[PDB]
Amino acid sequence: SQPIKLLVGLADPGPEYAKTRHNAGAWVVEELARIHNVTLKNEPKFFGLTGRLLINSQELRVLIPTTFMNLSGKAIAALANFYQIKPEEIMVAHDELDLPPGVAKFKQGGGHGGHNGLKDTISKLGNNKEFYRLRLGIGHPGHKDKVAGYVLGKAPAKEQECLDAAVDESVRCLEILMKDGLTKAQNRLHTFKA
Q: N or C terminus of the chain: which is more exposed, having fewer CB within 10 Å?
């Protein structure tokens, strides 16, 4: 038994942005869908790429928005509302600045942290912060003002392995979450540091 009906991987659309740090959330959803053999369908009604996975043996919906980052809320709200999914049953995977590359953490609630995606999500789900997040560490640059370009950049090769390891392990622990629950999934993921 466990709370998550919809995993969302946040993203800037198109091939120019596919390898940037701000697209980490989507890397999770992408790997998890490759491993469970699901191809994401473009559903314009839901402003994104969606799909449905059977994972031991729970019904998990997945979504990568094709909106601008700052309107990810439209996709998540349109999909949630149509399948009758509540905020507390949504996990949103996103690049986290406050954590380094190689690290990932589950959490419920909290701030957007200046992340435009999470901001609009809070807002379109009706000023409700209490969806889960999967926070993927990406580090942060030197100055508050460099941030936007840090996130719209491609991590160099060696940081990108640390990232790819946290994606890999986040997926595994999402499989754990569906078999053993959040608590066990969380203990395991929060001892991982690449």
A: N
Bridge partner list, 108:
132
Domain boundaries, the chain: 1-194
Q: How far apart are the two ends of the chain, measured CA to CA in Å?
A: 29
Pairing state of beta strands 132-137 and 104-108? antiparallel
Active site residues: 22
DSSP assignment string, the chain: --S-SEEEE----STTTTTSGGGHHHHHHHHHHHHTT-PPEEEGGGTEEEEEEEETTEEEEEEEE-S-GGGTHHHHHHHHHHTT--GGGEEEEEEETTS-TT-EEEEES---TT-HHHHHHHHHTTS---SEEEEEE----SSGGGHHHHHTSPPPHHHHHHHHHHHHHHHHHHHHHHHH-HHHHHHHHTT---
Nearest to 132 by CA among 2, 1, 39: 2
Tokens 């928005």 appear where? 65
What is the β-pairing status of strands 58-65 and 90-96?
Answer: unpaired
Does the annotation place 116 within a ligand binding site? yes
Q: Identify the bridge partners of residue 136 per DSSP, sorted by sequence position.
A: 95, 104
81 labeled part of a ligand binding site: no
| Annotated binding-site residue? 23 | no
Resolution of the PDB structure in angstroms: 2.4
